[model samples]
Target: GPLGSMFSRIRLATPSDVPFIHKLIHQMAVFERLTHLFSATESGLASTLFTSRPFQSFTVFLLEVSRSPFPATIDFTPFFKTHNLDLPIDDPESYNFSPDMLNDVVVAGFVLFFPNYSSFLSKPGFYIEDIFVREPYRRKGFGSMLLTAVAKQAVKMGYGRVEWVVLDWNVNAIKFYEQMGAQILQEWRVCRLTGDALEAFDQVNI
Candidate 1:
């Protein structure tokens, strides 16, 4: 059950949650040995998440445990600016932050997702970009809960399928996916036009 654990809860990550989310992205990148490919930053993330300048569909579901009351919402724009992050202001902001006295857990893990179209089905599918649960939180079923949460969201919305990729070398991940009844694709290969290729594509002659 998604509510099996009362201590841990899942909630939509807001702009204020960018700091931890950014750190978590780095952690996942490190785990996958893709840090060299990781160029995400706090400010870029905020813009990617909240602004349609990138994608209006980006979303993160964060799981955490709370020991004391925390503010339901916080404005981290000023916090971003203080860190020298490239936060674009609409002048609707401040540097004020709630006292760091509460025993609020940052996040056990998070699942970032977006919608993709299945042309055959003529419907949207849930595409998970990244889903990770940190050490000490491993084997606690938080990961399963997060996956379940997204699956629930997918099915409830009439989405066609839930899909994500796992490194071919990560046996643990392969096993988990199989245990969850997700099939490993054999014929499909991921293709990308990123970084240099993306820039070069822009300069090519028609």
Candidate 2:
């Protein structure tokens, strides 16, 4: 009983983990098929993430895991039960680890987020910037775990809600989140101003 089935934990990102975090982010972009828009760099991340911003600061979290001889314990009762979708997975035995190799702590993924103000509720909401799990790590509970961790924090912090936008094409992701009592705001749309658009529009004559 003392030994666990599998080892995993979440921790705040540190300066030393920036390089790995940056790599994982690019991997996420590639998986999303948006490599063309990717422009994040290590130094840029270092400045924005690690630099002091005081009260308006954002945060980064990393989830790490180590595999041992223990059998994997995937529990999706809440999610699968709601959707009645069978767990489309191969034999769970494949997740077993061998005793021949030493267990190493590996970064499964990261979640970046910040606080957003809600005028309607007159409260601050937890805003998830991105939640990513490496390709191989997908479907292994890492995504749900990271998201669940953030939601739990928001609830604990007395926040009104936890919020994040999902790409429209991500149907599976939408289903995954929707089952968690989240809904898509069909009436709302995302607005953005960047690069030449922002530069060109900034000097509008008034």
Q: Which candidate leads the pack in TM-score? A: 1
Name every residue pair that clashes in candidate 2: none
lDDT of each: 0.69, 0.68
The residue-by-residue lDDT of candidate 2 on 96-171, one tens digit each, is 3211234555666788888898999999988888888765557766788778877877787778988888887999
Q: What C-alpha lDDT, on a 0 to 100 scale, does residue 106 get in candidate 1?
A: 42
Residue 79, candidate 2: C-alpha displacement in angstroms: 21
Name the regions of candidate 2 deviating beyond 4 angstroms: 1-5, 52-56, 68-103, 201-206
Best candidate according to lDDT = 1
**Ten-residue stretch with the least lDDT total in model 2:** 75-84
TM-score of candidate 2 against the unseen true structure: 0.75
Question: What CA RMSD would candidate 1 show?
Answer: 10.7
What lDDT tens digits, residue by residue, belong to model 1 across residues 63-162? Answer: 7643333444440110000111122312111111111334434466789988888999998988999998776456756778888888877887888988
